[PDB]
Amino acid sequence: MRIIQTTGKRKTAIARAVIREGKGRVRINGKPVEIIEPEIARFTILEPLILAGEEIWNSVDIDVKVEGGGFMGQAEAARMAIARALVEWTGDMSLKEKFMKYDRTMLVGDPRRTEPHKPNRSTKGPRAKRQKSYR
Amino acid sequence: FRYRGYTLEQLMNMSLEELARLFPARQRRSLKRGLTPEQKKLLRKIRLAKKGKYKKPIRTHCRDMIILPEMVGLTIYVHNGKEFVPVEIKPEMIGHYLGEFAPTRKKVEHG
Amino acid sequence: MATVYDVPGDLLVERVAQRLKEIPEIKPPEWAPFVKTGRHKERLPEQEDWWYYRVASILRRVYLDGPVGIERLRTYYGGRKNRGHAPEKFYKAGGSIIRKALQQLEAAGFVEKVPGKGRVITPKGRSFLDKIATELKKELEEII
Amino acid sequence: MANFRHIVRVAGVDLDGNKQLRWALTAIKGIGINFATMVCRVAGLDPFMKAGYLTDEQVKKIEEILADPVAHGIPRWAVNRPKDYETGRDLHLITAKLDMAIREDIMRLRRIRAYRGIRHELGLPVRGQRTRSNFRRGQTVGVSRKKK
Amino acid sequence: MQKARIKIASTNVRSLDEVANQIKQIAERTGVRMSGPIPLPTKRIRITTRKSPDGEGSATFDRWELRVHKRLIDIEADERAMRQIMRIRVPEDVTIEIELIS
Amino acid sequence: AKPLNERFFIPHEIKVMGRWSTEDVEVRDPSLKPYINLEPRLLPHTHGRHAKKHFGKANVHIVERLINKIMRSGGSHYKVAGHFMRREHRSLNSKKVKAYEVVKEAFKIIEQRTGKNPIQVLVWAIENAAPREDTTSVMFGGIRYHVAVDISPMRRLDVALRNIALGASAKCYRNKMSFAEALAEEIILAANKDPKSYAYSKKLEIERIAESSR
Amino acid sequence: MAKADYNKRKPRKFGKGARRCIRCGQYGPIIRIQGLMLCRHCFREVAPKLGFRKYE
RNA sequence: CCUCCCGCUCGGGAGGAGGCACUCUGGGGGGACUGCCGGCGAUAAGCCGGAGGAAGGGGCGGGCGACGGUAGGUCAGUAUGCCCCGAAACCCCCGGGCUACACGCGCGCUACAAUGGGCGGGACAAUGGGACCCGACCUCGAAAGGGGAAGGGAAUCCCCUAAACCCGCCCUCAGUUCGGAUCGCGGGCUGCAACUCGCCCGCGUGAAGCUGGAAUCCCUAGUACCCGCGUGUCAUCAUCGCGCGGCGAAUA
């Protein structure tokens, strides 16, 4: 068989993925892909897996562990890594360029994540000032 | 039930412990934990007045004492902050604070 | 061919809560829904399901965790209390529905207290579950 | 169903609506929304159905769980007033007992000459602090208890 | 022999690394088996403070860092092979803790 | 819950929100073709960051554009499952997360009556809700005019979707029109150009006041 | 006349009046309790010798 | 390899051996510089557009604020010229006052419901703080809390549960099951002591408010908008100040 370990990181959901051959296993943090309640962020994970095909999804075991705060955050870290897990597998430029033309959130993360809350002039949030009315 | 409690007299004979089940959470606490060394010199001047050595008109800065059944009858002088305001203590005053009855402000109209 | 891991938590909970009516060892005591309930409820419900879900969770949680305490399962529910116009804050549930529940499971043989100081599953609590999940995971492929 | 009505009378002659049993009693002063669902249990009814679907026989089961609730069950913190005026153990409160018991204790303080009774006469919260400018632009809290 | 832990922290970066490196160099050659100098966290300490003593207008607010870094070292040597290695000069200002177990 | 999972087998294949094929519709006008993300795929939430570039906002999934101009109204106050709200408004004093549900249920409530691919009723409601002409109180040379200004295909879309999203919250106001409904009954009637769309009443008036002034 | 000593003798078990600094000798003004009891104003003057860093 | 469960015997999951791969931790190194390509520009400076690429043309966010001025602000933090007090404008003490209100405004929180409420279930973080201090876990108590007690001066233990989310169920748009003021009572907790003047828990009580005139403020992207989370100071008053991550735009 094989072991190709990859990563996928979006807004600090770090997905730890492994792609070995088998029988159609989809593991997320220990639980099948079935346990999630929002239908929505599931479909996001599902986007790459059809762009390539069910053929390669069925023939390969994917276990990922996404330690990330967001529900959509987890999903997004799962969308970037499967796509990178499937481009290392087959090896061709056909599956890589087909992802890039569709969206760059499969193969690029961000350049940025979050900004600090500025000291500010005694109010709440990074970018805000106390209200004025002294004119 | 006219007169607060079982009867005015039976709550002078139940003092420590048996009153407690009747009282608020707040009055219990200050009896049960105890009160300060000025509250110990106020147990001589209620006792000089009910009997014996020449009675002083009882004065107090005690506004954290909650009225008991033995102290019902005396005319208590509670310093409002400037001067002493009198209160004739009743059996309907069992279970309230002593600093309620004397004022914490002069009582006038606002404007 | 199934664990509590393989079944969604919306289909698992009415299948274990029924299997807590049926067996029929765990039951509602009368004092626990009446007015000894968890924090504030907009209404108090007169449900068997109410008791059978607060316990059907307890057999899933001790599976995942080791030393799962009373102070953990009181704080694990999710729910608040008003202070006023000051915004709400995070408080914990009623320890009465959690300290009788573990003990209704403890007499049933589903949960046991370990000698390290804590709460773990027995084999009888672990098999009661894997059978109820083998029935749920089998039905989830039949149904489009 | 158990014989449709739109107005059955519960708790004396005061009226039970067609909203829901748990909300129809809340109105009846003394029975709230948590205390309504404590007397649905003892009596043996479905709580979530409409009000007015009651024969004559259900209306008698509620009026005797009200007169003395501390006889049927109802814990000694889950009943309306526990430990009353220093010598009643527990009682019930209803539109006539609640109105009288709260004006009595207020009649008691004014004679006592306290800082609670005259603070309910001038127009003020006692422990809520600010009278500084709240109830602002001519406004008013309405203190206790009803401007509807 | 006696497995010793040298747990060595310092308030600044330059002072902590020189000692960690020197401790792994001198101990290497004698009667010592030594496990490598492992870096644990910086419990960076934030003091977040009001500049202005008026507390007036806009007041610009100082962010403070105190960063304290912790290297850890297991070693298999005697209590006599330990002092030989604890000879070293050490920056001001570098805390060196020693637990001793067999 | 079982239909829900069929809604997970079906978007896979590929379809929006679980059961709307993105091929059902076409953009017949060559104006609104590059300005619309009908053609690309699956999820709005995306977080693909826009306004990054000059037209970093044209490539926005039509529905995502819907979600956040449908999310708009919002201050200060605090939401959580507690007792707790409003704080997420008559238009998300809060997130695109519980926003995306509203638009999904509004695609469900507009599919239930019309029975067409709802992405053929909304893309038929954002080519009609946009006015073709606007007057700006524009002065140039110190001389105050109120002038013929024609509208650009990007600034069209925006006035289409925003007027659709502004009309519904006047109606949902403390009313049985739920935004999942109040939007679904705005999107049908902006597609039609009906006399009941607070979004096709400004479209017209903004062209008609702007014709007088020209 | 004659009387017994005074150097204050009342309760000051806890609060701000319990504290004083080790540089400007105050009760109500700031007392940073990390084992560095000073006011906020001293703190700013003292820190570069402490080894704190301005940079965020 | 080994212990436990389940099984359609194909196969799913946990523990410990075992293994440092991965995440991560903190120390160091490379990578972006208009380098290249086109267009505009005096072939210069520079601006625009393009390719490759994780990232681009101040990459992005902070700290970093000259000579001075408003006689701005503070001698009520300290330092200090001058003046004034001297059983006092000192000193000690208890109690009261700063928390008084017919009202006016500023800055904010909470809020006028179906994008909703109850109930249940399930999937998810980060900064931090923790010795008379964080407190596992076990027990009693409806709960607030009390009794017992492990670990922890810290990547190794604890606060700790994230919240928003979603799925099913009950409920079916009224000043209401909204909203929580006000008042009665029962009860805990700290301190000598919370009436004046603390917070929470339970039952009863259940006020204004059903989208707000003139006028006016804040901000330009991982930002605003939104959701919780921690810390400071610290017994206790936080709808505050500082700071963290989760969802994630409009227009320019």
Author numbering:
A (entry chain K): 1 to 135
B (entry chain T): 6 to 116
C (entry chain U): 1 to 144
D (entry chain O): 1 to 148
E (entry chain L): 1 to 102
F (entry chain H): 2 to 215
G (entry chain P): 1 to 56
What does the paper say about this structure?
In the second complex, the initiator tRNA is accommodated within the P site (the complex is therefore called IC1–PIN) and partially releases interactions with aIF2, reflecting the structural transition from the standby position to the decoding position. In IC1–PIN, the initiator tRNA is positioned in the P site. The density is consistent with the interaction of the anticodon with the start codon on mRNA whereas the 3′ methionylated extremity remains bound to aIF2γ. Indeed a bending of the tRNA molecule at the level of the hinge region was necessary. Notably, aIF2γ moves only very slightly in IC1–PIN as compared with IC0–PREMOTE and remains bound to h44 via its domain III. Overall, both the tRNA structure and the tRNA:aIF2γ interface are constrained in IC1–PIN. The remodelling of the TC is accompanied by the loosening of some contacts between aIF2 and the 30S subunit such as those involving the long L2 loop of aIF2γ–DII and the aIF2α–D3 domain. The inside of the L-shaped tRNA, occupied by aIF2β in IC0–PREMOTE is now occupied by aIF1. The observed head movement is similar to that described for py48S when compared with 40S:eIF1:eIF1A, and corresponds to a clockwise rotation around h28 of about 6° from IC0–PREMOTE to IC1–PIN. Because the 3′ methionyl-adenosine remains bound to aIF2γ, the establishment of the codon:anticodon interaction induces a structural constraint in the TC. This suggests that aIF2 exerts a spring force on the tRNA adjusted in the P site, which brings back the tRNA in the ‘remote' conformation if there is no correct start codon in the mRNA available.
However, archaeal translation initiation uses three initiation factors, aIF1, aIF1A and aIF2, homologous to their eukaryotic counterparts. To further address the role of e/aIF2, we have analysed the full archaeal 30S initiation complex (30S IC) by cryo-EM. We isolated two conformational states of the 30S IC at 5.34 and 7.5 Å overall resolutions, respectively.
